[PDB]
Structures are given as structure tokens and as C-alpha cells.
């Protein structure tokens, strides 16, 4: 019994366990996880169409909004479901050959698969409406998406390990995520905000990731200065190292 084999078996078990819980009992979760993006699409199209037309006459609103909204939804889902993974299956650690990290990575892969399915469905329904869906540079987009996924999973694991035995922290990080919806500039193009507050907004790694994903997805998309991938990449690597180290230090204390 190699450790990889039992790890894969428990991951598949834990994975389908998270699936059953997250998806509806009547096989209906696809309905709401497809309804969440379209409502935001409708309200932002009915609220900011002419503003985007005044912004730039080059890229239409639906595809530009989807290509930033779906990665942000994946990031927020990764953080939220990852930080609550350990304090949701406390009765599961009674059996041996299981660890909290198995639960957190099962939730991570479930969220990744669900959001990938939603992204593919949105791209298909966008191409069915005569829009532009094919990425011009797909490899850079894949790399940016991988970096964003790693950053989100790392932040979720860090919040899961750090905020054990204090649920109240999980209460406040949600209110830290609401302004991040508007700070990241996913809805409106960042080219319109004046530079007077740009240097404070360049410290958001997801902002850099979203602009780089849009640049790699669209042909002839202008990226402003200081949107290098180096800063979010280093942020993700450092946070992942810190979270893995903190989990390794507080290993036996985590499972109880």
C-alpha cells in the first residue's frame, strides 16, 4: 500500500463526498451555479453598457465581462470553500489514513472542476450568440489561470489553518471580499479610473492576474504599466510556502 495510492483513494472518496454536499440532493446544483453569473451579467449590462461604449469602442461588454468575472468567481469560491474545509468534517478524522489537507484539496479540485465547467458553458453560449470566444493566446491564459488558482487555494489553506478555534475571523473575511469585487476592476475597465489612486490598487494580485488574462485572451488589448506577472506570482509562491509551513507546524493540533 503505497502512500500515493491510499491518498488517491481517500481523495476520490473525499472529492465525491464534497460533491454530494455542494451539489443539490436532486441533481440541481448546476442550475444555481449557472444562475449566479447570468444575474450579474444582466445587471451590469443594463447598468454600464453605455459607460463601456464611452470607455473603448473595441471590445463588446458580454465577453469582456465574462472573461474576468468567471476567474474572480473561481478565486472567491476557492477562498470561501477552502477556509471552511477543516471545520466542516470534524467527524471524519476519527478514521485513520485521513488528514485535513485531503479534505481541503478535495474541495479545491471540486471547485476547480465546477468553475471550469461553468466557464466552458459560458464560452459555448457566448459563441452560440455570434460573439468572439476563441482565445488568441491560450497558453499565456492557461498560465495566468494556473497562477490565480494556486493563489486562491493557498490563501484558502492559509485561512483554514490560521483561523482554527476562532470562527469569528471567518465572519470578517467575507466582508473583506465584497470591496475586492470593485477594487479588482473586474466589472469596469481599469483604464477609466484616474491614476491618483493607481499605486494603492496595484497591490492586489488578482487585479494583475485579471488584466493579464484579458490581455492574453483578447487580440490587441492594451495593458497599463506595472501589471507584471512577477508580483502576483511571487505573492502566490510566498503565500503557498507560508501556508504549507503553517500546516506542517500545526499538524496534529489541527485534527481533533
Amino acid at each position: 500500500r503505497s502512500p500515493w495510492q491510499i491518498q488517491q483513494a481517500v481523495l476520490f472518496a473525499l472529492f465525491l463526498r464534497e460533491l454530494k454536499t455542494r451539489l443539490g440532493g436532486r441533481w440541481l446544483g448546476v442550475f444555481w451555479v449557472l444562475l449566479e453569473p447570468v444575474a450579474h451579467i444582466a445587471v451590469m449590462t443594463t447598468l454600464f453598457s453605455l459607460a463601456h461604449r464611452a470607455a473603448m469602442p473595441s471590445i463588446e461588454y458580454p465577453v469582456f465581462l465574462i472573461t474576468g468575472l468567471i476567474p474572480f468567481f473561481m478565486f472567491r469560491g476557492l477562498v470561501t470553500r477552502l477556509m471552511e474545509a477543516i471545520d466542516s468534517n470534524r467527524g471524519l478524522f476519527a478514521y485513520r489514513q485521513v488528514k485535513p489537507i485531503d479534505t481541503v484539496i478535495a474541495r479545491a479540485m471540486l471547485e476547480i472542476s465546477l468553475q471550469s465547467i461553468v466557464y466552458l458553458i459560458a464560452l459555448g453560449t457566448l459563441g452560440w450568440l455570434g460573439f468572439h470566444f476563441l482565445p488568441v493566446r491560450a497558453l499565456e491564459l492557461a498560465g495566468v489561470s494556473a497562477v490565480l488558482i494556486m493563489l486562491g487555494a493557498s490563501l484558502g489553506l492559509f485561512f483554514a489553518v490560521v483561523t482554527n478555534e476562532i470562527p469569528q475571523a471567518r465572519a470578517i473575511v467575507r466582508i473583506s471580499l465584497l470591496p475586492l469585487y470593485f477594487v479588482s476592476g473586474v466589472i469596469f475597465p481599469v483604464h477609466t479610473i484616474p491614476p491618483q489612486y493607481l499605486p494603492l490598487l496595484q497591490l492586489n494580485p488578482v487585479l494583475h492576474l485579471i488584466e493579464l488574462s484579458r490581455a492574453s485572451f483578447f487580440p490587441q488589448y492594451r495593458v497599463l504599466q506595472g501589471i507584471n506577472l512577477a508580483y502576483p506570482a511571487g505573492f502566490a509562491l510566498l503565500s503557498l510556502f507560508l501556508a504549507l509551513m503553517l500546516y506542517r507546524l500545526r499538524r496534529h493540533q489541527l485534527a481533533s
Binding site: 472529492f15 460533491l19 473603448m56 473595441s58 472542476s113 465547467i117 491560450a138 497558453l139 492557461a142 490587441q220
Partner: protein, 200 residues
């Protein structure tokens, strides 16, 4: 239920990974044909309306008929018999000819200068440069005729069409790499779905 139980990993691997790689490699390294690109950057000056009219006119049908009369695009694009995908098959419809031509010449526009860049593809570099030059000349004649028909303005060529040395669009290694990434992601997702429906 019985057919999804008959299915295993190895047949899924062969039907999703190795066979697409075999056909893609066979097509790219043997069947593909080089497509040289000529790039030009122009604007219209005595005015976003004028370059908007120009951008609509480049992909129009009358310009396509004029260029077909001049340089015989249909005869040129049917030459690469080796490539079945990017060649213009003889006896095809007028609408497919227009779609093929619109795919071949790509027109882009920036919002903060109004500069209009055109990239014309061709199977011979001299033909690509000639097609770009003919497009520019016809555009200049069109805007001058539009000015004269009302009863002044001339085209400014920031960058005249280049003569390419090597083709750039039929990229094989980058396409193979992104196909590998997409195929791996699709296999992983569909294998997770197969595993979770089989367990049910």
C-alpha cells in the same frame, strides 16, 4: 450503464489524447502549408467616421470583386493542394469566398490613435505584399471618390506593407502545446465526470 462499465481508462486515453496528437502532428508537420503575412498601418486624414467607413470597406464585397479582377485571388488561394483546410476549393460559393477572404485579411483598430492596421496572408510573400498594396490603393481611391461624389482628403501611410521573409501564422509547436493543455484539461474533467457517474 453497461456501456459506461465497459469503458475504462486506456480506451479513453487513446480516444482523447494520443489519437488527436497523431492527427495534429501528421497535419502540421506534413499537410500544413506556410502562410506569409504582410503588415501595413494606415490612417485617413484631410475623423473616426472616415476610418470607420474604411474598416467596413476593406471587408466589403465590392472590394473583393475588384481585387479578384485585379490579382485573381481565387486562382492563387487554390494552389496549395497539400493543405485541405486553408486552401480555397474550386467551385465554391461566393459567400464562402467572402468568408475566406475576410479570414485571410485581418483589420485591427486602436481606440487612442485611430490607426488602422491590416495583415494580409498569402502563400507567396510577393503576392501578399501586392494584395496589401492593392488594398491600400483601392481604399485611397474609395475615400477620394466618396469625397467627390458629394460634389479633399488623402490616406496617410504610417507603415507601408512589408515583404515577409518567412511565414508566421501556421505555428506548429505553439499550437501543439496549447492543444496538449486543452486536451489534458478536457480529459481530466471528463474522467472525473465518468468516475462520479460510474460510482452512482
Amino acid at each position: 450503464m453497461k456501456l459506461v462499465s465497459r469503458l475504462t481508462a486506456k480506451r479513453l486515453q487513446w480516444a482523447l489524447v494520443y489519437l488527436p496528437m497523431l492527427v495534429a502532428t501528421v497535419y502540421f508537420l506534413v499537410f500544413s502549408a506556410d502562410r506569409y503575412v504582410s503588415e501595413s498601418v494606415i490612417t485617413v486624414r484631410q475623423s473616426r467616421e472616415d476610418t470607420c467607413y474604411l474598416q467596413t470597406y476593406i471587408h466589403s464585397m465590392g472590394l473583393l470583386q475588384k481585387l479578384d479582377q485585379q490579382l485573381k485571388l481565387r486562382e492563387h488561394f487554390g494552389t496549395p493542394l497539400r493543405d485541405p483546410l486553408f486552401r480555397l476549393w474550386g467551385g465554391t460559393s461566393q459567400e464562402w469566398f467572402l468568408e475566406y477572404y475576410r479570414s485571410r485579411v485581418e483589420v485591427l483598430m486602436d481606440d487612442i490613435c485611430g490607426l488602422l492596421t491590416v495583415r494580409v496572408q498569402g502563400f507567396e510573400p510577393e503576392f501578399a505584399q501586392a494584395l496589401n498594396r492593392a488594398i491600400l490603393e483601392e481604399s485611397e481611391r474609395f475615400v477620394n471618390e466618396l469625397s467627390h461624389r458629394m460634389a479633399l482628403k488623402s490616406l496617410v501611410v504610417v507603415e507601408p506593407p512589408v515583404l515577409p521573409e518567412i511565414a508566421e501564422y501556421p505555428r506548429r509547436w505553439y499550437n501543439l502545446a496549447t492543444l496538449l493543455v486543452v486536451c489534458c484539461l478536457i480529459y481530466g474533467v471528463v474522467s472525473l465526470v465518468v468516475a462520479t457517474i460510474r460510482d452512482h
